[PDB]
Amino acid sequence: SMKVTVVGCTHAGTFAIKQILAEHPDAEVTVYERNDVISFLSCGIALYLGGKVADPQGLFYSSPEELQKLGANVQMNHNVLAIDPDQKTVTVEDLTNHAQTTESYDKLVMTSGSWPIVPKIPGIDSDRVKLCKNWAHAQALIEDAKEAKRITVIGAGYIGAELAEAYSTTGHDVTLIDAMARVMPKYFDADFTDVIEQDYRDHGVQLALGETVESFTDSATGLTIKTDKNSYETDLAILCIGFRPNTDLLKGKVDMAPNGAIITDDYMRSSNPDIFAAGDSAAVHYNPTHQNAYIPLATNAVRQGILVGKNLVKPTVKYMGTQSSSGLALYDRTIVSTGLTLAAAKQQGLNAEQVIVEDNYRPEFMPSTEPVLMSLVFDPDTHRILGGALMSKYDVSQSANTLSVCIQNENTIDDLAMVDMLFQPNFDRPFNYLNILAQAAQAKVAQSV
Amino acid sequence: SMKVTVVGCTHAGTFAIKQILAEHPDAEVTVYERNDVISFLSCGIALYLGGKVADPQGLFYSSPEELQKLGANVQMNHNVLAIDPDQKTVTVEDLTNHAQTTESYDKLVMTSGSWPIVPKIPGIDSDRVKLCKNWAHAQALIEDAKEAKRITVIGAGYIGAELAEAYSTTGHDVTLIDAMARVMPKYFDADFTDVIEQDYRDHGVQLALGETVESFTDSATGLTIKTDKNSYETDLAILCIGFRPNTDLLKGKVDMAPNGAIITDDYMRSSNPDIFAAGDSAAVHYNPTHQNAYIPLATNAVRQGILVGKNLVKPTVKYMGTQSSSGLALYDRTIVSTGLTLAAAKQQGLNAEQVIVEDNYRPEFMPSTEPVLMSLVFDPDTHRILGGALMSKYDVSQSANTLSVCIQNENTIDDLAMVDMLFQPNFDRPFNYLNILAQAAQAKVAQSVN
Numbered sequence: 001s002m003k004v005t006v007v008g009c010t011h012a013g014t015f016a017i018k019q020i021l022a023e024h025p026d027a028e029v030t031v032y033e034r035n036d037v038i039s040f041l042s043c044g045i046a047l048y049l050g051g052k053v054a055d056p057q058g059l060f061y062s063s064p065e066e067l068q069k070l071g072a073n074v075q076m077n078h079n080v081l082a083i084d085p086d087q088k089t090v091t092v093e094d095l096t097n098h099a100q101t102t103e104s105y106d107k108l109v110m111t112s113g114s115w116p117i118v119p120k121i122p123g124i125d126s127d128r129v130k131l132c133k134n135w136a137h138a139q140a141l142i143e144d145a146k147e148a149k150r151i152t153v154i155g156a157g158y159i160g161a162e163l164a165e166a167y168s169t170t171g172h173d174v175t176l177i178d179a180m181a182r183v184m185p186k187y188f189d190a191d192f193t194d195v196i197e198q199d200y201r202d203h204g205v206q207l208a209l210g211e212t213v214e215s216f217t218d219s220a221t222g223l224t225i226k227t228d229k230n231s232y233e234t235d236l237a238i239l240c241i242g243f244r245p246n247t248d249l250l251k252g253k254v255d256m257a258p259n260g261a262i263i264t265d266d267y268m269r270s271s272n273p274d275i276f277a278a279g280d281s282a283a284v285h286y287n288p289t290h291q292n293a294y295i296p297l298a299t300n301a302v303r304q305g306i307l308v309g310k311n312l313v314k315p316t317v318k319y320m321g322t323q324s325s326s327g328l329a330l331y332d333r334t335i336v337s338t339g340l341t342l343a344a345a346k347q348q349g350l351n352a353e354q355v356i357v358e359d360n361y362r363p364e365f366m367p368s369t370e371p372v373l374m375s376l377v378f379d380p381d382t383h384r385i386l387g388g389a390l391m392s393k394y395d396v397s398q399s400a401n402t403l404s405v406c407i408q409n410e411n412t413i414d415d416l417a418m419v420d421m422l423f424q425p426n427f428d429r430p431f432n433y434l435n436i437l438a439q440a441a442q443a444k445v446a447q448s449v
Numbered sequence: 450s451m452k453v454t455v456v457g458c459t460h461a462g463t464f465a466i467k468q469i470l471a472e473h474p475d476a477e478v479t480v481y482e483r484n485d486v487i488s489f490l491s492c493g494i495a496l497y498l499g500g501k502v503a504d505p506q507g508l509f510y511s512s513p514e515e516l517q518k519l520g521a522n523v524q525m526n527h528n529v530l531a532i533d534p535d536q537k538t539v540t541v542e543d544l545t546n547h548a549q550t551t552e553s554y555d556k557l558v559m560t561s562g563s564w565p566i567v568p569k570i571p572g573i574d575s576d577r578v579k580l581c582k583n584w585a586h587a588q589a590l591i592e593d594a595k596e597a598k599r600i601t602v603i604g605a606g607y608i609g610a611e612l613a614e615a616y617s618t619t620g621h622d623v624t625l626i627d628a629m630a631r632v633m634p635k636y637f638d639a640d641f642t643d644v645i646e647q648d649y650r651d652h653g654v655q656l657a658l659g660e661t662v663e664s665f666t667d668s669a670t671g672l673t674i675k676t677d678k679n680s681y682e683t684d685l686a687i688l689c690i691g692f693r694p695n696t697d698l699l700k701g702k703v704d705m706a707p708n709g710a711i712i713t714d715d716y717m718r719s720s721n722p723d724i725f726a727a728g729d730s731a732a733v734h735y736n737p738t739h740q741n742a743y744i745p746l747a748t749n750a751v752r753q754g755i756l757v758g759k760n761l762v763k764p765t766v767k768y769m770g771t772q773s774s775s776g777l778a779l780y781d782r783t784i785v786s787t788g789l790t791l792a793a794a795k796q797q798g799l800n801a802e803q804v805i806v807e808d809n810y811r812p813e814f815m816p817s818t819e820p821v822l823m824s825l826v827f828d829p830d831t832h833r834i835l836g837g838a839l840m841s842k843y844d845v846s847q848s849a850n851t852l853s854v855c856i857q858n859e860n861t862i863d864d865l866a867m868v869d870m871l872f873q874p875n876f877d878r879p880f881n882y883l884n885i886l887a888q889a890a891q892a893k894v895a896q897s898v899n
């Protein structure tokens with residue numbers, strides 16, 4: 001029978017394994033994972049630190065026992081040391097007693113994920129510099145937070161943004177550093193991030209944008225962070241400056257993007273037809289540009305894991321690509337986006353324009369309403385939608401998924417301007433705010449004629 | 450200059466006129482409207498009666514003066530008496546002095562909308578039987594609600610459902626009657642309406658489903674509504690049993706559906722190439738069946754009005770059809786749908802199956818969460834999505850628009866099962882609840898193959 005080795009098991013491995021066992025229940029699935037847990041939802045770290053998670057065990061949705069019971073041979077506390085695609089073997093280390101074994105496989109599933117970027121900076125080994133990725137890291141932050149009044153968050157991507165918000169609302173003195181000039185520059189245009197930065201300033205967070213850490217130095221009173229433009233004193237520094245694919249086991253053995261992301265076909269197969277990849281080990285197929293990209297999100301892991309299982313024996317279900325839809329909640333605002341920002345489209349040489357629209361999401365005659373700030377990015381010539389974003393105190397998150405479906409189907413601003421959407425004054429004006437947004441894009445293109 | 454006559458101006462006429470004047474500023478636009486107002490949002494009636502509207506002037510978004518300022522010749526309080534397409538004339542009555550005039554047109558915009566269905570029943574002329582459509586009706590209801598403790602709502606469609614809830618939450622004794630066995634049968638399947646009906650009962654509303662009124666009889670202490678199965682004593686009856694297209698001016702003169710809805714091409718042109726129709730006077734192109742239908746919603750009026758304006762001279766923008774997406778809020782529940790119910794699909798002989806899924810919309814580890822009851826209706830062979838619905842105390846209304854776009858693009862359950870949707874625990878589980886819904890449809894189709 002078919003022998004399947006799965007390297008790594010947080011989310012992609014978990015979904016791949018369950019899918020493989022459901023659709024090929026004779027297969028012999030072995031999974032290796034360095035940790036002693038699986039399925040930890042790292043989104044819960046900031047939620048716990050912000051006082052929003054009562055029981056942290058609720059942040060796990062599966063377990064080794066569950067996978068074992070389903071028919072998998074589950075090897076926790078094991079570190080895969082080598083993969084030999086020519087001989088189709090893996091060499092593994094039991095972390096409890098150091099014992100090494102070598103095993104054969106017919107199909108290998110590379111769900112080894114990512115690891116935080118850790119720059120080579122003097123002092124980075126300090127006990128006061130911590131990572132924020134897995135359950136081990138979360139437990140350390142849960143313990144440190146009590147004694148750490150002053151917290152420096154290094155990196156203002158999604159992780160840093162959520163941490164800075166969580167610590168600031170729980171009475172800590174927060175400084176937020178990013179190398180770029182704005183917070184979350186990858187995800188929103190300046191009209192959005194200007195508003196978010198002002199929120200941070202209003203809540204007492206110190207912004208240190210356009211700065212890179214040169215050194216960490218311990219002192220009698222805490223940790224000294226020297227940037228190229230300033231020096232900060234802190235009790236705890238959290239490093240969250242992005243992800244690096246954890247794929248060295250296959251470096252030089254399968255096609256990879258420059259950063260090591262495994263390239264796959266539409267069935268999640270690597271350049272080696274017996275080696276699949278899913279999750280943060282793999283590039284995504286990014287529909288707005290029709291290019292490979294590396295934008296690691298749990299949504300990719302659960303989908304690609306399922307596809308590995310469906311395609312393990314022969315191509316069966318095509319990968320649909322992604323829009324990299326994403327969002328978060330900060331200080332009572334919902335902020336969501338999908339596809340390209342205008343900044344990114346222009347940076348990549350694409351033909352792109354944008355409208356920004358601020359409207360109340362439902363009529364003023366209602367008992368209450370809320371402004372929603374909206375962005376639509378489009379090709380001014382083909383009118384193809386390239387991306388969009390929404391921000392409101394009203395929960396507009398579901399509208400980013402509507403835009404995702406629009407992009408998935410290559411819809412234009414003219415489609416979105418008139419496509420049927422319901423009207424009821426509890427929810428919107430006679431035209432939905434997404435119709436209104438696209439109508440403003442029409443008006444921009446028409447004025448350009 | 451091109452001469453344009455617009456018959457009727459609540460919403461579709463308003464949007465057509467603004468679009469015409471913007472795209473052809475020189476055209477001479479004359480609009481006739483029976484009432485003395487335009488742009489009244491009838492959705493505000495239930496809201497006002499429910500105590501949710503402070504200033505009812507906020508329920509108007511435009512005005513005769515605004516259209517006049519924009520260049521229209523606005524003839525309020527005028528009633529169009531005749532339309533002769535062969536001669537391209539309209540005959541009109543000034544209601545203030547009965548003066549009639551006849552005018553020529555190059556293009557006519559039929560935005561005459563609809564009127565409530567009023568059946569031929571003994572006693573229906575009573576002062577205690579009221580309509581619930583326009584601003585005149587609203588003002589009458591606002592006055593009478595003060596004294597009438599017992600309200601009978603005749604018709605459990607959207608209007609009736611919202612009225613019953615509005616009156617029930619402001620201290621009235623409400624009885625809700627429908628000829629059909631369920632409330633809102635056109636819009637949701639029984640798993641949803643069973644829940645809504647229980648909601649009405651829990652709030653003291655008396656349901657009289659599967660009953661038709663035989664007579665209204667004034668009695669010593671109120672009005673007696675006689676049905677084929679019971680009798681009810683009320684202080685006010687509201688008749689809201691559907692809309693009829695108000696199209697008699699053109700009956701015999703342009704192709705119509707059996708109920709009088711004007712059939713249009715993809716440019717909103719009637720069978721007479723100089724007469725356009727938009728709004729409740731017109732049929733919609735219903736995408737799930739690819740057939741004409743009559744499902745009057747304000748969403749159609751605003752869209753078709755715009756399209757009339759863009760297509761008045763030459764075909765410029767095609768009509769995309771509709772899924773008839775619709776929904777409402779009742780007792781803290783958001784309830785939305787798009788496309789076909791299972792019941793409707795099978796009543797029309799379509800090949801169709803359904804999955805019902807109830808899940809919390811976001812993870813249980815959050816400080817709160819809410820169940821969402823979901824339905825997906827689909828062709829089990831092609832996998833095409835035919836319709837869907839969601840119900841939750843969390844505001845899931847936007848998800849009905851996601852489904853609408855899925856149907857607009859002829860997407861399948863397999864598309865929806867995997868299409869990219871964001872994950873953040875403030876909003877959903879790793880898979881969005883719409884992904885989860887379609888994955889359950891996938892599981893149902895898989896079980897039926899072996």
Ligand SMILES: Cc1cc2nc3c(=O)[nH]c(=O)nc-3n(C[C@H](O)[C@H](O)[C@H](O)COP(=O)(O)OP(=O)(O)OC[C@H]3O[C@@H](n4cnc5c(N)ncnc54)[C@H](O)[C@@H]3O)c2cc1C
Nearest residue numbers: 008010011012034042043080112113114133279280297298
């Ligand atoms: C704080 C934080 C918050 C986040 N919030 C969100 C959010 O809100 N929404 C969203 O969509 N995404 C979010 N993400 C991203 C999401 O968590 C990741 O995309 C997801 O963890 C990737 O899943 P994965 O299974 O592919 O890889 P991983 O989670 O990285 O796990 C891969 C596993 O492989 C193991 N492994 C690696 N090498 C070996 C080896 N040689 N031998 C044995 N085992 C090995 C590792 O121990 C690891 O456990 C967040 C991430 C973080 C850190």
Ligand SMILES: Cc1cc2nc3c(=O)[nH]c(=O)nc-3n(C[C@H](O)[C@H](O)[C@H](O)COP(=O)(O)OP(=O)(O)OC[C@H]3O[C@@H](n4cnc5c(N)ncnc54)[C@H](O)[C@@H]3O)c2cc1C
Nearest residue numbers: 457459460461483491492529561562563582728729746747
């Ligand atoms: C209580 C109520 C609540 C509603 N709630 C919603 C909701 O929440 N969401 C939604 O999408 N839809 C809702 N609707 C439906 C929506 O209001 C209608 O679809 C909309 O009014 C149709 O607009 P219209 O301009 O095409 O037609 P109409 O509003 O019917 O206006 C047509 C106009 O033409 C005039 N007219 C007719 N004949 C003549 C003539 N010979 N001469 C001169 N004038 C004439 C009439 O006076 C009328 O003003 C609701 C309707 C009602 C009654």
Ligand SMILES: NC(=O)C1=CN([C@@H]2O[C@H](COP(=O)(O)OP(=O)(O)OC[C@H]3O[C@@H](n4cnc5c(N)ncnc54)[C@H](O)[C@@H]3O)[C@@H](O)[C@H]2O)C=CC1
Nearest residue numbers: 155156157158159160178179180240241242296326327328
């Ligand atoms: N709500 C959501 O969707 C969430 C998803 N994630 C995703 O997990 C992955 C990792 O998250 P992040 O660590 O925040 O990565 P990120 O890619 O989202 O942000 C990294 C930030 O670090 C900055 N940066 C890079 N190098 C730096 C340096 N030397 N010094 C200072 N700043 C530097 C970058 O300008 C960038 O803003 C991302 O793909 C993220 O989208 C994580 C948390 C929440």
Ligand SMILES: NC(=O)C1=CN([C@@H]2O[C@H](COP(=O)(O)OP(=O)(O)OC[C@H]3O[C@@H](n4cnc5c(N)ncnc54)[C@H](O)[C@@H]3O)[C@@H](O)[C@H]2O)C=CC1
Nearest residue numbers: 604605606607608627628629689690691744745775776777
């Ligand atoms: N939130 C929303 O979308 C709303 C939109 N509307 C729309 O306005 C239009 C008219 O609204 P409604 O009057 O509610 O029509 P409707 O078509 O929604 O419902 C009419 C109801 O009356 C029943 N009925 C028909 N004849 C009857 C009879 N002789 N006796 C008793 N019951 C009878 C029907 O079974 C039906 O349930 C509809 O198209 C509606 O969708 C109106 C209010 C709110």
